[PDB]
Amino acid sequence: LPLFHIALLVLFMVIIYAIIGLELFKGKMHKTCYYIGTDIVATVENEK
Amino acid sequence: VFTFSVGQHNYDRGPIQWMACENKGYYYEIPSIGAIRINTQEYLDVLG
Amino acid sequence: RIKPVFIDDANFRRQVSYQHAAVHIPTDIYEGSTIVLNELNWTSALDDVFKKNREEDPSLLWQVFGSATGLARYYPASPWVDNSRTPNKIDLYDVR
Amino acid sequence: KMTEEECRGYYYVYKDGDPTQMELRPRQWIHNDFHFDNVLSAMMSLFT
Amino acid sequence: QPKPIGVGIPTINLRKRRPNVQNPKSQEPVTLDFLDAELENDIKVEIRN
Numbered sequence: 001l002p003l004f005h006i007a008l009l010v011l012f013m014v015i016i017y018a019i020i021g022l023e024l025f026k027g028k029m030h031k032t033c034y035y036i037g038t039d040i041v042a043t044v045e046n047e048k
Numbered sequence: 049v050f051t052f053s054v055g056q057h058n059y060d061r062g063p064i065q066w067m068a069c070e071n072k073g074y075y076y077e078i079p080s081i082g083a084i085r086i087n088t089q090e091y092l093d094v095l096g
Numbered sequence: 097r098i099k100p101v102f103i104d105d106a107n108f109r110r111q112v113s114y115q116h117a118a119v120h121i122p123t124d125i126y127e128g129s130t131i132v133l134n135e136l137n138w139t140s141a142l143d144d145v146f147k148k149n150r151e152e153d154p155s156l157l158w159q160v161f162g163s164a165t166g167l168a169r170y171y172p173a174s175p176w177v178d179n180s181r182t183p184n185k186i187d188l189y190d191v192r
Numbered sequence: 193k194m195t196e197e198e199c200r201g202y203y204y205v206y207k208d209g210d211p212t213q214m215e216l217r218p219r220q221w222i223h224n225d226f227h228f229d230n231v232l233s234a235m236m237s238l239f240t
Numbered sequence: 241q242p243k244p245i246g247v248g249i250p251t252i253n254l255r256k257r258r259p260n261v262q263n264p265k266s267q268e269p270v271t272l273d274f275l276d277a278e279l280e281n282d283i284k285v286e287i288r289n
């Protein structure tokens with residue numbers, strides 16, 4: 001029971017940060033470098 | 049009867065080995081792509 | 097290793113050497129194994145028969161022994177059409 | 193290749209699992225960065 | 241002819257084609273039937289048999 005306030009604070013902080021990130025980084029991570037004229041993503045050995 | 053065990057799995061392989069070398073055959077394992085070329089051609093050693 | 101002379105030739109639109117025989121080992125098969133080095137040890141005795149076959153009939157084309165270990169010894173010696181990785185290309189040739 | 197002497201030469205790597213798209217890589221006998229070969233390396237691995 | 245025997249209709253997907261992979265070309269034999277090298281006729285089949 002005493003951890004209810006902490007959980008409420010955590011939830012509200014998650015909500016605020018989620019909305020801030022929604023306003024800042026919305027639809028920005030949609031470009032990656034494909035190969036020439038193909039649908040293949042170009043990376044190196046141990047790079048995601 | 050030549051039997052092939054394909055892939056990486058935890059299933060029992062004893063029955064198919066028995067099927068292989070009960071009926072004058074052979075048993076092969078193909079765990080990856082690199083194994084296919086060499087394992088799908090060695091059945092001609094038995095036929096000779 | 098051996099460095100052949102590789103004169104040009106007719107009936108072969110390539111450069112070939114009649115002194116010895118060439119050996120093709122697939123890319124994914126390691127040369128220098130005990131299995132491989134033993135094949136290269138006893139199969140060498142075929143070069144004399146290769147040369148005798150040619151000298152009996154000078155119109156022979158490739159004579160090749162295809163080993164069960166993936167080796168291929170053919171006569172006359174001639175560079176392989178597709179070397180391993182000097183260009184971006186590789187070869188996928190197993191005699192079996 | 194299950195031994196140091198077999199792990200020699202070159203082998204094919206297939207990109208995106210495609211059997212037709214192949215490269216050549218040398219075969220090398222890799223040793224894990226964190227191992228248990230002696231007590232010091234064991235303690236390092238356990239610390240991680 | 242020295243060309244390889246063709247089969248079906250050649251379909252390729254240029255969007256899944258890496259530029260530096262060295263895909264295989266061909267390994268099939270040039271098997272051309274006698275009736276596929278000339279005009280098929282009811283007497284030529286008898287002659288071939």
Ligand SMILES: *[C@@H]1O[C@H](CO)[C@@H](O[C@@H]2O[C@H](CO)[C@@H](O[C@@H]3O[C@H](CO)[C@@H](O)[C@H](O)[C@@H]3O)[C@H](O)[C@H]2NC(C)=O)[C@H](O)[C@H]1NC(C)=O
Nearest residue numbers: 130132133134135136137138139140141142143144145169
């Ligand atoms: C496979 O490789 C081995 C070793 O390279 C070859 O065996 C070697 O054969 C030569 C000639 O047959 C031997 O030379 C001989 O030495 C004796 C003295 O021991 C001498 O009396 C002879 O007149 C001759 O010079 C050589 O000793 C021998 N090597 C060993 C370690 O025994 C073998 O011939 C190769 N296989 C084929 C098919 O060529």
